[PDB]
Amino acid sequence: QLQSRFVKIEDETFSATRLITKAEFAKRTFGNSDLETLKQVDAMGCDPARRQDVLIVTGRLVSQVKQDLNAWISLFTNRWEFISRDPPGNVFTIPGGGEVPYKLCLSALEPGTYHAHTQLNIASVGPGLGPGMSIVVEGEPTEKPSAWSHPQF
Ligand SMILES: [Cu+2]
């Protein structure tokens, strides 16, 4: 099993199983996928009714241990970008024996067929993965800014 015995990821729900890339959405909406236009898409935030590149994953983290734990959350299977997370901190607390609802909002960046899972990382313990779901992303690859750098010109 891929769940942690310490904290279970329960009631995982994915808002969609078919999306387009952030670039494909920019192209369709604005006519181009330049870095500047990708920033206009980013300005829309977590709005998958408007943005066809956005996935929402929701669920609840349920603790089976006696003490508070520290954790962070991500999406398992660069190709995806975070828009927002709840809880919001880089690390958050999961109370002992308690429950933390979560919401992850992501932009699909690159085309492909992904088997995606909520991934929990419990500090000092390790990972837990929720149930997967297959998500197909279509559309043009989203460009990233160059990693080249030089002294200011
Ligand atoms: Cu999978």
Side-chain angles (χ1 to χ4, degrees), residues 9-71:
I9 293 168
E10 302 187 8
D11 300 308
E12 180 188 58
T13 296
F14 291 81
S15 60
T17 57
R18 299 202 58 99
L19 296 178
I20 67 181
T21 59
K22 191 194 297 187
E24 190 64 27
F25 176 73
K27 171 176 192 191
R28 287 184 187 185
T29 300
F30 298 105
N32 69 80
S33 56
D34 284 357
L35 292 174
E36 231 162 46
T37 309
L38 293 174
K39 298 180 157 163
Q40 297 180 267
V41 171
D42 294 339
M44 299 176 183
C46 188
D47 189 357
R50 184 173 266 107
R51 280 181 66 168
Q52 272 74 57
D53 63 317
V54 169
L55 176 66
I56 297 175
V57 184
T58 52
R60 297 184 302 137
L61 307 175
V62 178
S63 169
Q64 303 192 297
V65 303
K66 299 172 168 190
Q67 68 192 92
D68 295 357
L69 295 172
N70 292 330

XYZ file of all heavy atoms in Angstrom, residues 9-71:
490
model
N -4.419 9.919 3.469
C -4.975 10.924 2.532
C -6.348 10.340 2.130
O -6.419 9.272 1.485
C -4.073 10.993 1.304
C -2.704 11.573 1.738
C -4.732 11.834 0.155
C -1.654 11.380 0.595
N -7.416 10.982 2.589
C -8.754 10.461 2.381
C -9.625 11.388 1.496
O -9.342 12.601 1.374
C -9.441 10.271 3.742
C -8.640 9.305 4.668
C -9.378 8.967 5.956
O -10.580 9.338 6.115
O -8.739 8.352 6.833
N -10.627 10.778 0.846
C -11.650 11.572 0.105
C -11.037 12.434 -0.989
O -11.499 13.546 -1.268
C -12.436 12.382 1.096
C -13.144 11.455 2.120
O -13.822 10.544 1.689
O -12.874 11.559 3.282
N -9.986 11.910 -1.608
C -9.284 12.685 -2.663
C -10.241 12.882 -3.869
O -10.925 11.914 -4.293
C -8.060 11.922 -3.046
C -7.228 12.604 -4.130
C -6.133 11.691 -4.611
O -6.442 10.574 -5.081
O -4.956 12.080 -4.544
N -10.340 14.129 -4.415
C -11.219 14.355 -5.548
C -10.423 15.183 -6.535
O -9.715 16.073 -6.083
C -12.459 15.188 -5.159
O -13.220 14.434 -4.212
C -13.285 15.462 -6.397
N -10.564 14.894 -7.833
C -9.881 15.665 -8.859
C -10.965 16.397 -9.619
O -12.015 15.797 -9.994
C -9.143 14.733 -9.830
C -7.967 14.030 -9.204
C -8.159 12.888 -8.429
C -6.681 14.525 -9.396
C -7.075 12.242 -7.845
C -5.570 13.889 -8.795
C -5.791 12.737 -8.030
N -10.708 17.674 -9.936
C -11.783 18.472 -10.599
C -11.972 18.117 -12.080
O -12.975 18.507 -12.681
C -11.475 19.976 -10.496
O -10.219 20.262 -11.144
N -10.975 17.508 -12.707
C -11.086 17.203 -14.141
C -10.162 16.062 -14.492
O -9.146 15.854 -13.816
C -10.642 18.437 -14.973
N -10.469 15.383 -15.608
C -9.547 14.368 -16.097
C -9.016 14.727 -17.486
O -8.213 13.984 -18.027
C -10.226 12.997 -16.221
O -11.361 13.138 -17.088
C -10.613 12.463 -14.822
N -9.448 15.856 -18.048
C -8.923 16.282 -19.351
C -8.661 17.770 -19.254
O -9.568 18.513 -18.854
C -9.951 15.995 -20.501
C -10.292 14.508 -20.658
C -10.832 14.165 -22.051
N -9.848 14.548 -23.088
C -8.979 13.722 -23.694
N -8.948 12.410 -23.419
N -8.126 14.214 -24.594
N -7.458 18.196 -19.626
C -7.100 19.612 -19.532
C -6.331 19.974 -20.774
O -5.958 19.090 -21.531
C -6.174 19.791 -18.340
C -6.779 19.464 -16.956
C -5.640 19.664 -15.937
C -7.884 20.441 -16.686
N -6.037 21.261 -20.939
C -5.059 21.693 -21.955
C -3.892 22.370 -21.241
O -3.977 22.677 -20.027
C -5.675 22.614 -23.047
C -6.095 23.935 -22.411
C -6.876 21.911 -23.704
C -6.747 24.944 -23.394
N -2.794 22.611 -21.948
C -1.636 23.257 -21.267
C -1.871 24.731 -21.028
O -2.751 25.343 -21.677
C -0.353 23.109 -22.093
O -0.582 23.706 -23.368
C 0.004 21.611 -22.336
N -1.081 25.339 -20.149
C -1.169 26.789 -19.922
C -0.904 27.531 -21.239
O -1.639 28.471 -21.604
C -0.128 27.242 -18.877
C -0.380 28.673 -18.417
C 0.782 29.334 -17.649
C 1.185 28.695 -16.336
N 2.212 29.612 -15.687
N 0.110 27.078 -21.985
C 0.358 27.702 -23.297
C -0.826 27.572 -24.274
O -1.145 28.546 -25.021
C 1.674 27.176 -23.913
N -1.435 26.371 -24.326
C -2.574 26.167 -25.256
C -3.736 27.106 -24.846
O -4.388 27.708 -25.713
C -3.075 24.724 -25.243
C -4.092 24.404 -26.349
C -3.518 24.521 -27.760
O -2.286 24.359 -27.993
O -4.328 24.782 -28.650
N -3.931 27.251 -23.542
C -4.969 28.169 -23.047
C -4.646 29.631 -23.391
O -5.525 30.359 -23.879
C -5.179 28.052 -21.534
C -6.163 29.066 -21.025
C -7.538 28.922 -21.281
C -5.704 30.186 -20.297
C -8.460 29.867 -20.806
C -6.635 31.134 -19.821
C -8.006 30.953 -20.067
N -3.391 30.019 -23.216
C -2.950 31.392 -23.597
C -3.158 31.649 -25.080
O -3.647 32.723 -25.496
C -1.494 31.601 -23.225
N -2.761 30.679 -25.892
C -2.907 30.810 -27.354
C -4.392 31.026 -27.713
O -4.725 31.886 -28.557
C -2.320 29.546 -28.042
C -2.594 29.442 -29.545
C -1.888 28.233 -30.145
C -1.937 28.329 -31.673
N -1.501 27.035 -32.285
N -5.270 30.218 -27.139
C -6.713 30.205 -27.512
C -7.352 31.518 -27.050
O -8.217 32.097 -27.719
C -7.448 29.001 -26.844
C -7.036 27.688 -27.540
C -7.769 26.446 -27.027
N -7.192 25.237 -27.629
C -7.650 23.984 -27.479
N -8.733 23.735 -26.770
N -7.007 22.967 -28.062
N -6.855 32.031 -25.930
C -7.543 33.158 -25.228
C -7.018 34.518 -25.655
O -7.802 35.462 -25.876
C -7.323 32.992 -23.709
O -7.892 31.729 -23.326
C -8.076 34.128 -22.899
N -5.686 34.582 -25.778
C -4.925 35.821 -26.098
C -4.279 35.840 -27.460
O -3.928 36.898 -27.932
C -3.867 36.109 -25.017
C -4.469 36.349 -23.653
C -4.391 35.376 -22.669
C -5.094 37.545 -23.362
C -4.983 35.594 -21.424
C -5.674 37.806 -22.149
C -5.623 36.805 -21.132
N -4.176 34.687 -28.103
C -3.605 34.624 -29.433
C -2.129 34.251 -29.478
O -1.544 34.147 -30.550
N -1.493 34.060 -28.315
C -0.037 33.742 -28.308
C 0.292 33.202 -26.936
O -0.473 33.406 -25.983
C 0.906 34.967 -28.610
C 0.936 36.016 -27.508
O 1.631 35.885 -26.440
N 0.205 37.094 -27.728
N 1.418 32.505 -26.834
C 1.840 31.959 -25.512
C 3.216 32.520 -25.024
O 4.018 31.795 -24.417
C 1.892 30.429 -25.620
O 2.757 30.065 -26.693
N 3.463 33.795 -25.280
C 4.733 34.486 -24.944
C 4.806 34.471 -23.411
O 3.791 34.419 -22.733
C 4.571 35.987 -25.295
C 4.653 36.275 -26.787
O 4.900 35.380 -27.661
O 4.465 37.445 -27.094
N 5.984 34.607 -22.836
C 6.065 34.695 -21.352
C 5.154 35.764 -20.743
O 4.543 35.570 -19.671
C 7.539 34.967 -20.947
C 8.520 33.792 -21.208
C 9.941 34.315 -20.890
C 8.165 32.490 -20.432
N 5.043 36.924 -21.410
C 4.179 37.998 -20.915
C 2.711 37.609 -20.876
O 1.978 37.965 -19.942
C 4.303 39.226 -21.832
C 4.577 40.521 -21.105
C 5.115 41.565 -22.082
O 4.542 41.710 -23.181
O 6.101 42.225 -21.750
N 2.288 36.857 -21.882
C 0.898 36.433 -21.931
C 0.633 35.311 -20.892
O -0.449 35.220 -20.317
C 0.593 35.964 -23.337
O 1.027 37.028 -24.260
C -0.860 35.742 -23.476
N 1.619 34.475 -20.677
C 1.493 33.440 -19.611
C 1.310 34.129 -18.236
O 0.582 33.607 -17.350
C 2.715 32.510 -19.689
C 2.867 31.621 -20.923
C 4.214 30.863 -20.894
C 1.708 30.630 -21.166
N 1.956 35.268 -18.014
C 1.665 36.068 -16.797
C 0.249 36.635 -16.699
O -0.303 36.726 -15.614
C 2.701 37.199 -16.625
C 4.105 36.642 -16.437
C 5.100 37.769 -16.276
C 6.349 37.262 -15.548
N 7.501 38.210 -15.724
N -0.380 36.940 -17.831
C -1.767 37.356 -17.826
C -2.657 36.151 -17.427
O -3.690 36.348 -16.783
C -2.212 37.835 -19.190
C -1.442 39.078 -19.641
C -1.912 39.527 -21.004
O -1.347 39.147 -22.014
N -3.002 40.272 -21.029
N -2.275 34.968 -17.872
C -3.064 33.759 -17.483
C -2.872 33.582 -15.955
O -3.851 33.345 -15.164
C -2.574 32.499 -18.222
C -3.252 31.246 -17.628
C -2.883 32.614 -19.723
N -1.624 33.696 -15.514
C -1.351 33.536 -14.049
C -2.177 34.481 -13.200
O -2.619 34.106 -12.068
C 0.135 33.791 -13.683
C 1.075 32.785 -14.256
O 0.682 31.671 -14.617
O 2.269 33.138 -14.357
N -2.407 35.687 -13.704
C -3.203 36.689 -13.023
C -4.657 36.249 -12.764
O -5.323 36.757 -11.844
C -3.136 38.037 -13.784
N -5.155 35.280 -13.538
C -6.501 34.757 -13.305
C -6.575 33.928 -12.014
O -7.689 33.673 -11.500
C -6.959 33.921 -14.503
C -6.991 34.790 -15.766
S -7.434 33.716 -17.130
C -7.342 34.810 -18.574
N -5.431 33.436 -11.543
C -5.423 32.549 -10.325
C -6.165 31.244 -10.483
O -6.234 30.704 -11.594
N -6.671 30.700 -9.361
C -7.267 29.359 -9.373
C -8.696 29.407 -9.841
O -9.630 29.476 -9.019
C -7.245 28.728 -7.979
S -7.773 26.986 -8.083
N -8.887 29.427 -11.157
C -10.209 29.649 -11.728
C -10.402 28.666 -12.869
O -10.304 29.062 -14.042
C -10.251 31.105 -12.279
C -11.650 31.561 -12.712
O -12.589 30.788 -12.660
O -11.773 32.735 -13.151
N -10.614 27.358 -12.554
C -10.695 26.407 -13.628
C -11.946 26.522 -14.470
O -11.966 25.942 -15.542
C -10.652 25.041 -12.869
C -11.359 25.350 -11.576
C -10.752 26.685 -11.236
N -12.976 27.268 -14.041
C -14.125 27.513 -14.918
C -13.731 28.382 -16.091
O -14.268 28.219 -17.197
C -15.298 28.149 -14.151
N -12.802 29.294 -15.847
C -12.259 30.178 -16.903
C -11.046 29.532 -17.603
O -10.925 29.589 -18.832
C -11.890 31.506 -16.282
C -11.403 32.556 -17.300
C -11.188 33.925 -16.705
N -12.362 34.803 -16.837
C -13.120 35.108 -15.801
N -12.788 34.610 -14.629
N -14.157 35.907 -15.914
N -10.142 28.966 -16.820
C -8.834 28.471 -17.320
C -8.904 26.982 -17.538
O -9.016 26.206 -16.559
C -7.804 28.701 -16.190
C -7.305 30.113 -16.118
C -6.287 30.231 -14.999
N -5.063 29.440 -15.291
C -3.954 29.561 -14.601
N -3.939 30.382 -13.534
N -2.849 28.870 -14.950
N -8.688 26.540 -18.774
C -8.821 25.118 -19.095
C -7.526 24.361 -18.790
O -7.475 23.170 -19.033
C -9.131 24.900 -20.596
C -10.630 24.939 -20.861
C -11.099 26.352 -20.789
O -10.601 27.199 -21.506
N -12.122 26.611 -19.932
N -6.543 25.030 -18.197
C -5.305 24.370 -17.792
C -5.238 24.043 -16.287
O -4.197 23.523 -15.810
C -4.069 25.264 -18.145
C -4.068 26.561 -17.403
O -5.171 27.208 -17.300
O -2.969 26.979 -16.970
N -6.318 24.338 -15.558
C -6.251 24.280 -14.099
C -6.920 23.021 -13.553
O -8.035 22.666 -13.940
C -6.853 25.548 -13.467
C -7.044 25.395 -11.957
C -5.965 26.739 -13.803
N -6.208 22.393 -12.634
C -6.684 21.223 -11.845
C -6.795 21.601 -10.403
O -5.818 22.141 -9.822
C -5.609 20.084 -11.965
C -5.947 18.834 -11.099
C -7.215 18.126 -11.623
C -4.720 17.906 -11.239
N -7.935 21.251 -9.783
C -8.085 21.294 -8.340
C -8.145 19.864 -7.782
O -8.919 19.022 -8.270
C -9.406 22.031 -7.960
C -9.355 23.516 -8.440
C -9.600 21.982 -6.427
C -10.692 24.258 -8.184
N -7.347 19.621 -6.733
C -7.404 18.331 -6.053
C -7.755 18.673 -4.619
O -7.060 19.511 -3.981
C -6.020 17.588 -6.090
C -6.184 16.181 -5.423
C -5.498 17.516 -7.525
N -8.762 17.994 -4.081
C -9.116 18.246 -2.692
C -9.170 16.928 -1.934
O -9.274 15.865 -2.564
C -10.485 18.961 -2.539
O -11.490 18.230 -3.289
C -10.411 20.417 -3.117
N -9.087 17.014 -0.609
C -9.194 15.793 0.239
C -9.017 16.150 1.696
O -9.135 17.332 2.071
N -8.731 15.148 2.532
C -8.566 15.440 3.933
C -7.382 14.592 4.381
O -7.231 13.468 3.902
C -9.804 14.945 4.763
C -11.164 15.561 4.471
C -12.235 14.992 5.495
N -12.264 13.510 5.353
C -12.318 12.604 6.345
N -12.409 12.967 7.632
N -12.327 11.307 6.051
N -6.528 15.174 5.224
C -5.374 14.443 5.810
C -5.813 14.047 7.203
O -6.284 14.897 7.990
C -4.168 15.352 5.896
C -3.831 16.012 4.568
C -2.676 17.020 4.746
C -3.420 14.963 3.513
N -5.744 12.751 7.474
C -6.297 12.239 8.740
C -5.212 11.555 9.546
O -4.635 10.512 9.144
C -7.467 11.284 8.466
C -8.000 10.725 9.811
C -8.537 11.997 7.656
N -4.898 12.137 10.701
C -3.775 11.630 11.526
C -4.162 10.415 12.346
O -5.235 10.391 12.944
C -3.292 12.740 12.486
O -2.388 12.239 13.477
N -3.282 9.407 12.359
C -3.432 8.212 13.170
C -2.403 8.121 14.279
O -2.287 7.083 14.962
C -3.382 6.992 12.254
C -4.489 7.136 11.190
C -4.745 5.887 10.389
O -3.858 5.389 9.654
N -5.971 5.363 10.511
N -1.694 9.213 14.530
C -0.652 9.203 15.583
C -1.066 10.125 16.747
O -1.957 10.962 16.619
C 0.746 9.653 15.072
C 1.225 8.789 13.896
C 0.691 11.083 14.625
N -0.383 9.991 17.867
C -0.807 10.713 19.061
C -0.347 12.152 19.088
O -0.984 12.996 19.700
C -0.383 9.925 20.295
C -1.050 8.568 20.264
C -0.526 7.656 21.363
C -1.425 6.440 21.464
N -1.106 5.639 22.683
N 0.694 12.486 18.348
C 1.251 13.794 18.516
C 1.120 14.560 17.230
O 0.902 13.942 16.170
C 2.712 13.691 18.931
C 3.576 13.137 17.809
C 4.934 12.767 18.325
O 5.147 11.625 18.718
N 5.829 13.757 18.423
N 1.262 15.879 17.321
C 1.314 16.741 16.137
C 2.497 16.397 15.233
O 3.591 16.031 15.708
C 1.436 18.209 16.532
C 0.205 18.718 17.282
O -0.799 17.978 17.471
O 0.256 19.904 17.686
N 2.226 16.448 13.937
C 3.253 16.255 12.901
C 3.353 17.448 12.013
O 2.346 18.162 11.790
C 2.869 15.058 11.994
C 2.837 13.702 12.697
C 2.270 12.632 11.776
C 4.251 13.274 13.117
N 4.539 17.630 11.434
C 4.759 18.657 10.400
C 4.793 17.983 9.030
O 5.328 16.891 8.914
C 6.091 19.384 10.590
C 6.060 20.230 11.819
O 4.999 20.696 12.183
N 7.186 20.344 12.515
N 4.189 18.640 8.054
C 4.047 18.053 6.721
C 3.995 19.090 5.610
O 3.719 20.278 5.841
C 2.792 17.182 6.700
